[PDB]
Amino acid sequence: LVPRGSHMEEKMLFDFIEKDLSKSGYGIYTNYIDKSSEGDITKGHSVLSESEGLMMLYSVNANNKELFDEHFDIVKEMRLKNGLISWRKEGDENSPSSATIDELRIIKALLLANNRWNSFYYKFYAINIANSLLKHAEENETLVDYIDNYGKGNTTTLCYLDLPTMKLLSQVDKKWEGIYEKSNSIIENGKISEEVPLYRKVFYEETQKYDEEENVDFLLSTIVILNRIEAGENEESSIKWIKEKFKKDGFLVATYNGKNGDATSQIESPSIYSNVALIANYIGDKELFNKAIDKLKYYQIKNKDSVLYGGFGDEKTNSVYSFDNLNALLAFQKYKD
Ligand SMILES: [Mg+2]
Numbered sequence: 001l002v003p004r005g006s007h008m009e010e011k012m013l014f015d016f017i018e019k020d021l022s023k024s025g026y027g028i029y030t031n032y033i034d035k036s037s038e039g040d041i042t043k044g045h046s047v048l049s050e051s052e053g054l055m056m057l058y059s060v061n062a063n064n065k066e067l068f069d070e071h072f073d074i075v076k077e078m079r080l081k082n083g084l085i086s087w088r089k090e091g092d093e094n095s096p097s098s099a100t101i102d103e104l105r106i107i108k109a110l111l112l113a114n115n116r117w118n119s120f121y122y123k124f125y126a127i128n129i130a131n132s133l134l135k136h137a138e139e140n141e142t143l144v145d146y147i148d149n150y151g152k153g154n155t156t157t158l159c160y161l162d163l164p165t166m167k168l169l170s171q172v173d174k175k176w177e178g179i180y181e182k183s184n185s186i187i188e189n190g191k192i193s194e195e196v197p198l199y200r201k202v203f204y205e206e207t208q209k210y211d212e213e214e215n216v217d218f219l220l221s222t223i224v225i226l227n228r229i230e231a232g233e234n235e236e237s238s239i240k241w242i243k244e245k246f247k248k249d250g251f252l253v254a255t256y257n258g259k260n261g262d263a264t265s266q267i268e269s270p271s272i273y274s275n276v277a278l279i280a281n282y283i284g285d286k287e288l289f290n291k292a293i294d295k296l297k298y299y300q301i302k303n304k305d306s307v308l309y310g311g312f313g314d315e316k317t318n319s320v321y322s323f324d325n326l327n328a329l330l331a332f333q334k335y336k337d
């Protein structure tokens with residue numbers, strides 16, 4: 001009953017990300033190794049604003065203003081002439097393109113930071129980004145995924161529709177209510193089936209229709225589900241489906257058949273388990289939460305002699321993805337034992 005080694009997993013994982021996947025003043029690397037042997041992967045030590053946005057969310061949750069500011073300073077330098085944050089940098093070069101989901105994740109961290117630390121600067125900077133999203137990515141109240149200096153795409157991935165950020169934005173300015181309402185309508189009209197109450201992957205603004213994939217991308221649906229509930233919307237049937245599936249298979253994998261709900265992949269991911277844990281945390285489901293956390297504990301590299309100690313990835317090849325590690329850090333942050 002006296003806690004022993006509380007927050008150990010979080011510490012180990014933060015230590016790995018800070019010492020082994022980061023460079024001071026530069027940011028969080030996308031992969032542990034910049035170039036794989038044989039050259040298949042080549043930009044491992046680029047920095048994604050995805051990674052930075054995740055670390056900012058973690059910092060505000062951790063009430064760590066110093067760490068928050070250190071990653072926000074890197075993001076400010078990734079800002080492009082259109083007001084959006086670049087998707088990626090390599091050394092000193094920013095990519096001229098942006099993804100809506102990264103912009104919205106950063107706006108969310110900034111608005112949370114303003115609420116937490118009473119610092120208007122974060123809020124004003126978030127507004128600049130948000131106004132640029134409206135100017136550059138919006139079409140009939142729908143935000144499209146992709147934006148560069150020449151124009152924008154015409155597809156909307158449902159996991160990009162960050163309802164919680166749009167809700168926060170609506171509290172600052174009413175123009176965001178229409179965006180929230182359209183986004184939520186896209187989500188609500190995109191259920192896969194009654195048997196498998198997960199979500200479509202993409203919405204096509206031109207036809208107002210969804211993809212027709214037979215398989216559900218599970219990670220993406222967990223993102224949509226987490227977004228829905230944090231914004232106060234209803235996900236009772238989807239969460240039941242996840243809880244039943246996790247209970248019956250004993251694991252969750254990358255894809256399921258949209259008709260009958262059978263696993264169609266053998267691949268597990270720390271990002272899937274992270275999201276399931278964040279969902280369970282949010283709704284107060286302790287059993288689901290522990291089940292998801294147990295998977296993350298199991299896959300975390302526990303070997304003190306591995307350079308990957310504390311992290312997630314393949315010990316044999318030193319293959320590591322920042323995205324899985326950062327999502328795991330967010331889940332372990334909720335784990336109090
Ligand atoms: Mg422990």
Ligand SMILES: [Mg+2]
Nearest residue numbers: 016019020307
């Ligand atoms: Mg280390």
